[PDB]
Curated annotation (Swiss-Prot), chain B:
Effect seen on changing residue 316 to E: In allele TF*B2
Domain notes: Has a bilobed structure, each lobe binds a single Fe(3+) ion. Does not always bind 2 Fe(3+) ions. (Microbial infection) Binds to Neisseria transferrin-binding proteins A and B via its C-terminal lobe only. The L3 helix finger of TbpA inserts into the C-terminal lobe of TF, altering its conformation and probably disturbing the coordination of iron 2. Electron microscopy suggests that in the TbpA-TbpB-TF complex, TF is captured directly above the loop domain of TbpA in a chamber of about 1000 Angstroms(3) formed by the 3 proteins, where interactions between the proteins serve to abstract iron 2 from TF. Binding to TbpB does not alter the conformation of the C-terminal lobe.
UniProt effect for mutating residue 234 to S: In allele TF*C2
Described purpose of this protein according to its UniProt entry: Transferrins are iron binding transport proteins which can bind two Fe(3+) ions in association with the binding of an anion, usually bicarbonate. It is responsible for the transport of iron from sites of absorption and heme degradation to those of storage and utilization. Serum transferrin may also have a further role in stimulating cell proliferation.
Record: disease: Atransferrinemia: A rare autosomal recessive disorder characterized by abnormal synthesis of transferrin leading to iron overload and microcytic hypochromic anemia.
Residues bearing carbohydrate: 77, 136, 275
Binding-site positions, hydrogencarbonate 2: 116, 120, 122-123
Tissues in which the UniProt entry reports expression: Expressed by the liver and secreted in plasma.
Cysteines joined through disulfide linkages: 3-260, 9-41, 19-32, 66-338, 82-301, 114-187, 138-329, 148-162, 159-170, 227-241, 279-284
Quaternary state and interactors: Monomer. Part of a complex composed of SLC40A1/ferroportin, TF/transferrin and HEPH/hephaestin that transfers iron from cells to transferrin. (Microbial infection) Binds to Neisseria transferrin-binding protein A (tbpA or tbp1). Forms a large complex with TbpA and TbpB.
Protein name: Serotransferrin
Length: 853, 339
């Protein structure tokens, strides 16, 4: 439990906590802590937290002092097309690898660093000391859980032992699941989707004869029996939903999730038992493979018509070898290809996220306070993170959903494309933490220096197509006068049809500065910081604490990128608590926060021309929160009130100068600090003791005070917070059993609609000119669910846990989750006409069994 | 450098409105100046009143002699590198009924003709330019027994076919029904022997793609193409039987502003271009309130030009020599002055 820093405005979770709660997924952890949100990445993975009215790189994510890869979204490709893109996802952490996580609302930059603008999330690698004990000289643990919602199953085991000074800890975790099923009623077995199919042409000029099908000689012999041209006609077909293909898709796309995590933590105890020298090796690889079902598998005469109106008719259209009529139905593709009606297209994303971190740690500990430090530690970590997008498209199967199929001679009209975009980061980090004390003083020193990099590669980008070789030719002609076949029954065309010719172009270009440019975008640099914070206790009556920290970072690139040493950001926090008691007491908190430009924002906007790197200030934030709390037999009941100010916010836009005396935009598009907005929330939570057997109550709400722009800027949009999760109440009621071993719990989460004052905004152009915009096409609306959990630890070693979430079915659509639509989301969905696809799960059962020795 | 705004010449009221919304959203990076006709428009360009516009092959030729230069081309193909790859343009074709008789390229004399408009690329410049060497004089009223050429003298034999009533009969604009590629094809089906149009015209107006009653039952397969060698080919065969190939629409500007317009325009397309296209609550550059405005709606991206800097290299051999032998004699005032 708590607590490194008086005040509050944060929560704690422990391995045991997590387990009791049965959290297998990132969505799970914060499900009961209203005002914290997950932020879907649209391909089904994470991509950060949303807190205090912000999200993404605006809120930090740390593990054992090592920050986690940022959200990097590369600029959109043009023409065509449908390209892979950048994952934009943020690394997921294996909870079976962690001890107790700390979450904090409001600017945490003081103890987090950059990115702590809206809040912070910090993790802890599990300690070998989990062999406990005391007594036991070693330990072994096993966890097997099954989630019904995602039809997932997870298995983790941790074995550890400590011999003399030496010690070793090994954890392996693995998981297979996918797709997170919705409320059954979301959709069932329907719709239509017209699809193009071959029919005889009906024109009188539509007859033809193919060469290879005339055994004897020539046109005049073979003509006697001509084939008739085929023409496209769509027919209404009916399938099944889950088999259907968007738009109007009532489902969330198929997802295959898989993950493997390894943790090795040796440590050696040095001589006199104070000193500890140990090391760590972690590898966690998670994969998300999906198929976008929003993409119509078939044509569709409408598409054919589009292409006819643009490029006109195609040679051989309607002509077919033998009886094979779909042979005649094909149209204009992309990248100069003709795609056959007889195949169907599919789009697949194979997204793979790898984290690899190995390092050494040394810890000196003395008791009681004697030396210049009660607790001292040096930490060196080498970590790396990567996200491999790998988009593929194929139109070479019945589809059939085939991702392997490709273009070949035997498949005349086939198509294929592959676009792979890989974003990664690495850290080499030294950090030292020292804690000295006096008895009421608690001193804290935190130091660090790192060599870091962010590398974006673009590779495996190319296309393939076979196109049927065909010719319409005219017969001799021995006579001194020549006939031009018009296709009339008596004068059919003389046609050659042949194998598809396979061709593969490379799509990768260099120096063009657009999506298609594959030159590595690399950013390297050094960063240090010196942080000191101390708190003190005055009698029984009060407690105060304060901290100050200095950061410095310099980044180089070999390009005209926006890199620069960002300036000496210095931060602080102060806090107090009064204890007049009565069982009551009061609290006040103030802290500063900041974020440096996302490496994406540093790479710049890039219209395909030369661009200047325009240096940009960091995003800035100020948080003040005041609260009161009632301690006692019943428990603590806390109420909090907060104001967060945000300034120098980064957006794509233009500079604004005045003269004449009107405004003039200059000179080039890029990401600048154009704006500021303020929010104020209120957060209550308390846990009663009733002297049934207990219950817990949490409530949170957030309001938007104002939004204002740098006024030297323009073409900036406006803010549009879509990220604030609608206010909700969470009320649990539960019964344990002093030792008993068995337990029961129930929870009620209620959310109110959404506004709609937060989905609005203006583009803010020159003069009093601006266009009204919105983040989304519709609001979410209010809903409530009740979850019920239980567990029994028969023969206490083995503990079984069960739960039923959304006990009532209560079909609803959460806004999380629909945030995926528009609003410049990391990966945007469209056109989403239905919205049923965004429904939350119906009743679902999660079953877990843990055992330890 | 501090590139100043670019003025766009809007040929119509709607071209103007679109250009306005553009202006605003561009935050003045682009501004507009209206014109009565496409020609005087290119003139306002000439003197410095306007910085650019986009126009078809023939007009590209005219401005070309006027000393302007094409910066960027309109590309309608879907490609992963749209901007990099240059497009081959389109084909002018002479279309006839497959059920029509003996008509051949050489024997067109006395036949009834359907044209898009006078002075325009495929409906006039190319065909009349190729026949000019045959007849080698300037009166085309004499060659065909009759036809529809929109913009021709009202008492001209070439207005004899054109539909429409009163003053607008034979008019260069939609007031006249046989105006355009569309109007020309309609003319072919209802009246004329031959139609001079692009190779997309027939599929466009047949197969139910055109709602109007005269079309929509019309079978593309029922029409063919006249080849310069006397033979015929199907409509989808235009590549191997056609009069000449025109280039894609392109944007032109004076030599100095060339680099600038080039620069700003690309930014503009990345802001408002193909994707993002959300034309609902945002501004889309290529989408239009009515029809192609300042750009063909079919536009995907604006592309660079590898070997063709000059209007002559741009238009290509086939275009010229099918034209410029035609004018020679052209009643356009701007061309005369330009010479």
């Amino acid at each position: 439990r708590d607590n490194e820093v008086t005040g509050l405005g944060k929560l704690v979770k422990s391995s045991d906590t997590l387990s009791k709660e049965q959290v297998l997924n990132i969505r799970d952890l914060t499900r009961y802590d209203p005002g914290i949100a997950v932020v879907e990445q649209g391909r089904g993975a994470s991509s950060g937290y949303s807190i205090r009215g912000m999200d993404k790189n605006r809120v930090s994510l740390t593990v054992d002092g090592v920050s986690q890869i940022q959200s990097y979204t590369a600029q959109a490709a043009l023409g065509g097309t449908r390209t892979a893109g950048s994952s934009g996802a943020i690394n997921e952490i294996e909870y079976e690898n962690v001890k107790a996580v700390e979450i904090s609302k409001g600017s945490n930059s003081v103890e987090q660093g950059s990115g702590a603008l809206a809040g912070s999330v910090a993790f802890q690698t599990k300690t070998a000391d989990d062999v406990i004990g005391e007594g036991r000289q070693w330990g072994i643990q096993s966890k097997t859980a099954y989630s019904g919602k995602n039809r997932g199953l997870t298995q983790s085991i941790a074995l550890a032992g400590r011999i003399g000074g030496a010690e070793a800890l090994l954890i392996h975790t693995g998981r297979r699941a996918g797709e997170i099923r919705a409320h059954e009623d979301a959709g069932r077995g329907v719709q239509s989707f017209n699809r193009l199919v071959p029919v005889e042409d009906s024109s009188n000029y539509a007859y033809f004869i193919v060469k290879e099908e005339c055994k004897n000689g020539s046109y005049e012999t073979c003509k006697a029996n001509p084939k008739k041209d085929v023409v496209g006609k769509d027919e209404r077909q009916t399938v099944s939903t889950r088999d259907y293909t968007g738009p109007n898709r009532f489902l969330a796309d198929p997802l295959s999730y898989e993950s493997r995590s390894w943790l090795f933590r040796p440590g050696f105890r040095f001589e006199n038992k104070r000193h500890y020298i140990g090391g760590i090796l972690e590898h966690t690889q998670q994969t998300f493979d999906t198929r976008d079902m929003t993409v119509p598998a078939f044509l569709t005469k409408a598409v054919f018509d589009a292409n006819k109106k643009q490029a006109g008719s195609l040679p051989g259209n309607g002509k077919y070898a033998g009886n094979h009529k779909y042979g005649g139905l094909f149209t204009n593709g992309e990248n100069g290809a003709l795609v056959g009606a007889e195949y169907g297209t599919g789009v697949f994303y194979d997204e793979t996220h790898t984290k690899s971190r190995y390092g050494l740690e040394y810890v000196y500990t003395n008791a009681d306070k004697d030396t210049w430090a009660d607790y001292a530690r040096l930490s060196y970590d080498r970590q790396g993170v990567g996200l491999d997008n790998h988009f593929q498209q194929t139109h070479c199967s019945a589809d059939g959903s085939d991702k392997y199929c490709r273009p070949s001679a035997d498949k005349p009209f086939s198509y294929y494309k592959s676009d792979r975009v890989i974003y990664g980061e690495s850290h080499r980090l030294l950090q030292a933490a020292f804690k000295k004390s006096f008895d009421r003083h608690n001193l804290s020193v935190n130091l660090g220096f790192d060599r870091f990099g962010s590398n974006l590669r673009h590779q495996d980008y190319y296309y393939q197509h076979a196109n049927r070789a065909y010719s319409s030719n005219t017969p001799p002609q021995n006579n001194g006068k020549k006939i031009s076949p018009n296709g009339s029954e008596t004068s059919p065309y003389w046609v050659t049809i042949g194998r598809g010719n396979v061709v593969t172009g490379q799509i990768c270009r260099l120096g063009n500065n657009t999506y298609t440019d594959c030159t590595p975008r690399s950013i390297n640099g050094k960063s240090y910081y010196a942080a000191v914070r101390d708190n003190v206790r005055l009698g029984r009556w009060a407690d105060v604490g304060a901290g100050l920290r200095y950061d410095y970072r310099s980044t180089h690139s070999d390009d005209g990128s926006v890199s620069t040493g960002t300036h000496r950001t210095l931060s602080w926090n102060a806090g107090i608590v009064l204890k007049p008691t009565d069982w009551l007491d009061l609290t006040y908190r103030t802290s500063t926060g900041f974020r440096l430009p996302s490496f994406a924002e540093m790479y710049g906007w890039r219209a395909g021309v030369q661009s200047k790197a325009v240096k940009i200030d960091p995003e800035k934030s100020f948080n003040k929160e005041a609260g009161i709390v009632f301690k006692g037999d019943f428990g603590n009941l806390e109420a909090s009130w907060f104001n967060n100010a945000y300034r120098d916010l980064i957006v794509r836009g233009y500079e604004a100068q005045i003269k004449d005396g009107k405004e003039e935009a200059k000179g080039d598009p890029a990401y600048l600090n154009a704006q500021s907005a303020r929010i104020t929330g209120i957060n209550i939570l308390g846990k009663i003791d009733w002297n049934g057997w207990y219950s817990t109550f949490a409530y949170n709400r957030v309001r938007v005070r104002d939004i204002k722009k740098r006024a030297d800027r323009t073409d900036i949009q406006s803010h549009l917070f879509d990220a604030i999760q609608p206010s909700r109440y969470v009320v649990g009621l539960g019964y344990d059993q002093p030792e008993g071993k068995w337990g029961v719990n129930g929870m009620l989460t209620y959310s109110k609609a959404k506004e709609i004052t937060e989905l609005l905004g203006s583009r803010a152009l020159l003069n009093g000119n601006s266009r009204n915009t919105k983040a989304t096409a519709r609001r979410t609306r209010p809903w409530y669910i009740v979850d019920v959990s239980g567990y029994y630890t028969v023969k206490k070693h083995f503990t079984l846990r069960a739960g039923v979430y959304n006990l009532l079915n209560y079909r609803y659509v959460t806004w999380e989750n629909v945030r995926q639509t528009a609003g410049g989301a990391v990966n945007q969905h469209k056109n989403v006409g239905v919205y049923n696809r965004y429904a939350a799960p119906g009743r679902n059962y999660t079953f877990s069994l843990e055992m330890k020795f | 450098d501090e590139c100043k705004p670019v003025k766009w010449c809007a040929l119509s009221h709607h071209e103007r409105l679109k250009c306005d919304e553009w202006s605003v959203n561009s935050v003045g990076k682009i501004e507009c100046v209206s014109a009565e006709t496409t020609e005087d428009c290119i003139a306002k360009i000439m003197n410095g009143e306007a910085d650019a516009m986009s126009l078809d092959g023939g007009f590209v030729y005219i401005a070309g002699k006027c000393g302007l230069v094409p910066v960027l081309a309109e590309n309608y193909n879907k490609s992963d590198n749209c901007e990099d790859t240059p497009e081959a343009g389109y084909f002018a074709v002479a279309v006839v009924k497959k059920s029509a008789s003996d008509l051949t390229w050489d024997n067109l004399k006395g036949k009834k003709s359907c044209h898009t408009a006078v002075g325009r690329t495929a409906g006039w410049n190319i065909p009349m330019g190729l026949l000019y060497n045959k007849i080698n004089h300037c009166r085309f009223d004499e060659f065909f027994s009759e036809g529809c050429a929109p913009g021709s003298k009202k008492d001209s034999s070439l207005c004899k076919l054109c539909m429409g009533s009163g003053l607008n009969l034979c008019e260069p604009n939609n007031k006249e029904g046989y105006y355009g590629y569309t109007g020309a094809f309609r003319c072919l089906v209802e009246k004329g022997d031959v139609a001079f149009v692009k190779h997309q015209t027939v599929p466009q107006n047949t197969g139910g793609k055109n709602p109007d009653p005269w079309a929509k039952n019309l079978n593309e397969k029922d029409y063919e193409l006249l080849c310069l060698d006397g033979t015929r080919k199907p409509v989808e065969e235009y590549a191997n039987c056609h009069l000449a190939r025109a280039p894609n629409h392109a944007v032109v500007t004076r030599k100095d502003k060339e680099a600038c317009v080039h620069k700003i325009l690309r930014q503009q397309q990345h802001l408002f271009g193909s994707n993002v296209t959300d034309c609902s609550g945002n501004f889309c550059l290529f989408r239009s309130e009515t029809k192609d405005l300042l750009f063909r709606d079919d536009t995907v991206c604006l592309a660079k030009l590898h070997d063709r800097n000059t209007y002559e290299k741009y238009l290509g051999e086939e275009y010229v020599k099918a034209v410029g032998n035609l004018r020679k004699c052209s009643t356009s005032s701007l061309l005369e002055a330009c010479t």
